[PDB]
């Protein structure tokens, strides 16, 4: 199956409570493996998976350097964006950035993402060609022109194509026991309206459907690396389709 | 790993 690495960065401006808070998270598939919080005492990249702790201290040094550079960039970014929008200094504003890569079952490059959002709305998105930008509002034109003058699209494309894919392959090889694992969803029915439950499966991708002669909740993390989901219909078979299932399961009361 | 160059924003 296709495996993806992503990095999510959130910077929130605090009006007078101190410097803006910065949080960075790194995900492989649906499993987090790093974490940086600006208010944490360590102020270093922290491992959140058993396998990633195998990396030597030079890896953590490099990660901390990069993440602190990102923190400084976002701290500047909040101010420059407020200036671009001519917003008042009183309000708090949020800045989000997500970037990463995907690999297919053949473990070659398949897709790359880079996205920047201001106040929960799309601001600047790297296109699928990975050589151009997509800008929505007027300040986004200025940001795109500055970025094109900086030639950052080529650098980001090179990173996503080579380094993200190579290190995703390395992480998956290191975490073969956990990352390359499919768990069959334990499925059962409860009658009261019938609720069809799929519990303790991985990854989060599942499809539950209800058919008569042929509500839903977003998949929630169980907290132990597996997920749960259920679909209820008020009154008929529940069909569960998962990557880890050789054939989809059907349940009737 | 995080990107080195290109993190510059806005």
């Amino acid at each position, epitope marked *: 199956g296709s495996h993806s690495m992503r990095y999510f960065f959130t910077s929130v401006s605090r009006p007078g409570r101190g*410097e803006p808070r910065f949080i960075a998270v790194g995900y492989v598939d649906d499993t987090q493996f790093v974490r940086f919080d600006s208010d944490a005492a360590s102020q*270093r990249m922290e491992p959140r998976a058993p396998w990633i702790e195998q990396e*030597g*201290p030079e890896y*953590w*040094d490099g990660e*901390t*350097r990069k993440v602190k550079a990102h923190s400084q960039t976002h701290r500047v970014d909040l101010g420059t964006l407020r200036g671009y929008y001519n917003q008042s200094e009183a309000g708090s504003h949020t800045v989000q950035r997500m970037y990463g890569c995907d690999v297919g079952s053949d473990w070659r490059f398949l897709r790359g993402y880079h996205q920047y959002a201001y106040d929960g709305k799309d601001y600047i998105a790297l296109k699928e060609d990975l050589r151009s930008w997509t800008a929505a509002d007027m300040a986004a034109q200025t940001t795109k022109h500055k970025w094109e003058a900086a030639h950052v699209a080529e650098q980001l494309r090179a990173y996503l194509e080579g380094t993200c894919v190579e290190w995703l392959r390395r992480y998956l090889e290191n975490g073969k026991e956990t990352l390359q694992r499919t768990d069959a969803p334990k499925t059962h029915m409860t009658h009261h309206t019938l609720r069809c439950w799929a519990l303790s499966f991985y990854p989060a991708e599942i499809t539950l459907t209800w058919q008569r002669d042929g509500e839903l909740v977003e998949t929630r993390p169980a907290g132990d690396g597996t997920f749960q989901k259920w679909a209820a219909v008020v009154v008929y078979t529940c069909h569960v389709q998962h990557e880890g299932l050789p054939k989809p399961l059907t349940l009737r009361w | 790993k995080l990107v*080195v160059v290109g993190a510059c924003g806005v």
Partner: antibody, heavy 118, light 107 residues
Framework: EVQLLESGGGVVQPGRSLRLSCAAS????????MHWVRQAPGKGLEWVAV????????YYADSVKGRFTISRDNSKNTLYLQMNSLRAEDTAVYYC???????????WGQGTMVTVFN | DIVMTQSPATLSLSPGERATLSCRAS???????LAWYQQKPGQAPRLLIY???SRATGIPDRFSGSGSGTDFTLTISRLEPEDFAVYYC????????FGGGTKVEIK
């Protein structure tokens, strides 16, 4: 035994290029990024250049930007610095350093003198 | 750019006296990236403190480091005749930046 050895220093006239080579023995050279750091005679230490473990990321100081090129070759376990358009400001003792980390391992080369005059 | 300013420029202390050196960063720094070096007049610099608080291998107990954020300090509890040298502060969070250097000499 960890060891860094630098060669290529000497007297050079202004406007001419010089090459410095630092060979590392006793530790895994291919995993770590390396720095070139110069010290003027009687002056404090100044950082010149840095290179990553791939050699993909290289950075130079503001004073030496545009004239210095850092390189590494992990096959021969060597770290090179090519200095172009040398001026009277470029005279100093140069060191190749495996440092600037958090686990406390640093190795300093002997340091070779680069003097610029006529 | 990160700028590190060291104070005092020179120290004049008799042997056996306390020595305190200060290094101030232009911006907030991760405490794990500061180091303190000692350079003798005729040798290469030698790492004393790494991580702003941890001593290196084979460093006497008198050397200690403290501080966080922008301001850091290095303390020599009891000066020794061999402790008279030039002390630099270094940051490695972004590139590298050595301080001016505080030279301690006998009065």
């Amino acid at each position: 035994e960890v060891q860094l050895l630098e060669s290529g220093g000497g007297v050079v006239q202004p406007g001419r290029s010089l090459r410095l080579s630092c060979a590392a023995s006793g530790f895994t050279f291919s995993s770590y990024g390396m720095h070139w750091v110069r010290q003027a005679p009687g002056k404090g230490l100044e950082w010149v250049a840095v290179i990553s473990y791939d050699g993909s990321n290289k950075y130079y100081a503001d004073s030496v930007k545009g004239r210095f090129t850092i390189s590494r070759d992990n096959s021969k376990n060597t770290l090179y610095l090519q200095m172009n358009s040398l001026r009277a400001e470029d005279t100093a003792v140069y060191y190749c350093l495996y440092g600037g980390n958090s686990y406390g391992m640093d190795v300093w080369g002997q340091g070779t003198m680069v003097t610029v005059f006529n | 750019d990160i700028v590190m300013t060291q104070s005092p420029a020179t120290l004049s202390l008799s042997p056996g006296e306390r020595a305190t050196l200060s290094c101030r960063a232009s911006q907030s720094l991760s405490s794990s990236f500061l180091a303190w070096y000692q350079q003798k007049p005729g040798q290469a610099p030698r790492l004393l403190i790494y991580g702003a608080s941890s001593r290196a291998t084979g460093i006497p107990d008198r050397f200690s480091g403290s501080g966080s954020g922008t301001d850091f300090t290095l303390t020599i509890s009891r000066l020794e005749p061999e402790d008279f040298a030039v002390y630099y502060c270094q940051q490695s969070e972004s590139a590298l930046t050595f301080g001016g250097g505080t030279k301690v000499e006998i009065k």
